[PDB]
């Protein structure tokens, strides 16, 4: 039982938003069905539509006129189509499954930005360790002027994962990003062992590996 | 056309609490409550479903209670690793589909005192030759969850340049938070140290890098 979400990252307002979920588990069959659920950063959850074996389409009233959803048991795919998008739709959506109905499972649900703000690939820059020697050092890296969100980073190609901790983001009032992801390892380890993080801005089609040295 | 949820609740670790969603004749009553739960970072949960009943693997410190125009979702032996957001779910006849709670966030307050870890990254050797300087003050496991940064330029305070991200609940029920000097790199070269100063609960944690 694995849902998930697919998207564009950022939409320009008036224009249309169409998320996919591929499903896995199941089939639209018996009395089972497919949701979509969004929530804006830090807000509460609000149900958008949802459709069943019928092929039974419900929506919010709140949104008339820009709701489609529709269904595929051929590819196994469920699509919902959001018409006229404005910046108070910027939220996570997600896709759930649901079974007298209750939600039952989510996936993780895709970050979709309403701007008309372009993309913008991030700068990565090294934060390296003087902080004069301690038992443990603390290096990272500052993903520094991006839009829009989200970021992820890795170290090591995932092969490194105890020390790390990734921070929320900065909105500086550019209407830019930047984050940092630190590490913190044994200084005995800054030369036994070489460190890259693994920056992914997907909005931008972007991948750095940047290696942290001294 | 109702559904209330008040935003906040907390209880004392070990005991009982209630969230209660308040509505009318045509969203609780007469129609079956969800209840859902969602830890910081991490996807909703199914907590309780058709009122009463909840499905497997799902701790049995949870239970759902109806009656009339309320629902209440009860959690006993409170522990710390309950403090996220609870939501109820409900149909409407007034509207076509689906109505969410405003959600609640859970506290619980036994908890004790963490002073912050600061850690202070001077602009690096890159952004420095494309004439920038970007000060990086990361602060973590901290509670309570607020903090007052400030920055100062050889002791004096800093005016401008500073910017500073809400605190955000960790994995542990701590939290953590970043805050950034952006300078030029003529900026940063026309002092002789710059602090991040942390102010937790009254106490103070500065760290200071230099140019040279």
């Known amino acids: 039982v694995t849902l998930k979400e697919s998207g564009p990252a950022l939409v320009k307002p008036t224009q249309t938003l169409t998320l996919t979920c591929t499903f896995s588990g199941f089939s639209l069959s018996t009395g089972m069905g497919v949701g979509w659920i969004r929530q804006p950063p830090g807000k509460a959850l609000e149900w958008l539509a949802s459709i069943y074996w019928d092929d039974d389409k419900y929506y919010s009233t709140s949104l008339k006129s820009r709701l489609t959803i529709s269904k595929d048991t051929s590819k196994n795919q469920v699509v919902l189509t959001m018409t006229n998008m404005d910046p108070v739709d910027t939220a996570t959506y997600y896709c759930a499954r649901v079974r007298t109905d209750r939600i039952d499972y989510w996936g993780q649900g895709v970050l979709v930005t309403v701007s008309s703000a372009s993309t913008k690939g991030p700068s990565v820059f090294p934060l390296a360790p003087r902080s004069t020697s301690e038992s443990t050092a603390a290096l990272g890296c500052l993903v520094k002027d991006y839009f829009p969100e989200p970021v992820t980073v890795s170290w090591n190609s995932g092969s490194l994962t105890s020390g790390v901790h990734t921070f929320p983001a900065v909105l500086q009032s550019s209407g830019l990003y930047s984050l940092s992801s630190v590490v913190t390892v044994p200084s005995s380890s800054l030369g036994t062992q070489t460190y890259v993080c693994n920056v992914n801005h997907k909005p931008s089609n972007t991948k750095v590996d940047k290696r942290v040295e001294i | 056309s109702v559904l209330t949820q008040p935003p906040s609740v907390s209880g004392a670790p070990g005991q009982r609490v209630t969230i209660s969603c308040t509505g009318s004749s045509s969203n609780i009553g007469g129609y079956y409550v969800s209840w859902y739960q969602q830890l910081p970072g991490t996807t909703p949960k199914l907590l309780i479903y058709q009122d009463n009943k909840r499905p497997s693997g799902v701790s049995d410190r949870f239970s759902g209670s109806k009656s009339g125009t309320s629902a209440s979702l009860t959690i006993t032996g409170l522990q710390t690793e309950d403090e996220a957001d609870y939501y109820c779910?409900?149909?409407?006849?007034?509207?076509?589909?689906?109505?969410f709670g405003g959600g609640t966030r859970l506290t619980v307050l036994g908890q004790p005192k963490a002073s912050p870890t600061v850690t202070l990254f001077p602009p690096s050797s890159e952004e420095l030759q494309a004439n920038k300087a970007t000060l990086v003050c990361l602060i973590s496991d901290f509670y309570p969850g607020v903090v007052k940064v400030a920055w100062k330029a050889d002791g004096s305070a800093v005016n401008a340049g500073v910017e500073t991200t809400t605190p955000s609940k960790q994995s542990n029920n701590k939290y953590a938070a970043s805050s950034y000097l952006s300078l030029t790199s003529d900026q940063w070269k026309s002092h002789k140290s710059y602090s991040c100063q942390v102010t937790h609960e009254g106490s103070t944690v500065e760290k200071t890098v230099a140019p040279a």
């Open positions: 779910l409900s149909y409407d006849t007034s509207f076509s589909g689906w109505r």
